[PDB]
Amino acid sequence: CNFSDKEVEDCVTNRPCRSQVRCEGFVCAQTGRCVNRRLLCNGDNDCGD
Amino acid sequence: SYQSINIPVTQNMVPSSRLLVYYIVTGEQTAELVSDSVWLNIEEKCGNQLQVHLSPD
């Protein structure tokens, strides 16, 4: 069978939703990994970035 | 912006008095107590302010 056991559509924003969960730490720019401020200038990549 | 300390300097303060301010912030997961203090001179006015005078000046 065709590889289409899933199908997807776009929508109008009939309603908003909750924003993405607050990060109290630093936000890794590309990844947005929330990381602790003690893990900056650490000498290690904690972001994947 | 935080409310200022709008207060009357009440009569019990008239001897030079002191103020301290603080908050605890929970941090990422670790709390810290943050605080500061200041001296406040309150001009030595009595409560009674008893005024006594020779009327036949």
Swiss-Prot record, chain A:
It comes from the Eukaryota. Ca(2+) binds at residues 39, 42, 44, 46. Disulfide bonds join 23-34, 28-47. N-glycosylated; contains one or two bound glycans. Not O-glycosylated. Residues 21-49 form the LDL-receptor class A domain. Glycans are attached at residue 2. It is found in: Secreted; Target cell membrane. It is linked to Complement component 8 deficiency, 2: A rare defect of the complement classical pathway associated with susceptibility to severe recurrent infections, predominantly by Neisseria gonorrhoeae or Neisseria meningitidis. Belongs to the complement C6/C7/C8/C9 family. Component of the membrane attack complex (MAC), a multiprotein complex activated by the complement cascade, which inserts into a target cell membrane and forms a pore, leading to target cell membrane rupture and cell lysis. The MAC is initiated by proteolytic cleavage of C5 into complement C5b in response to the classical, alternative, lectin and GZMK complement pathways. The complement pathways consist in a cascade of proteins that leads to phagocytosis and breakdown of pathogens and signaling that strengthens the adaptive immune system. Heterotrimer of 3 chains: alpha (C8A), beta (C8B) and gamma (C8G); the alpha and gamma chains are disulfide bonded. Component of the membrane attack complex (MAC), composed of complement C5b, C6, C7, C8A, C8B, C8G and multiple copies of the pore-forming subunit C9. This is Complement component C8 beta chain. It comes from Homo sapiens. The gene is C8B. The chain holds residues 100 to 148 of 591 of the full protein.
Swiss-Prot record, chain B:
Transmembrane segments: none annotated. This is Complement C5 beta chain. The gene is C5. The chain holds residues 522 to 578 of 1676 of the full protein.
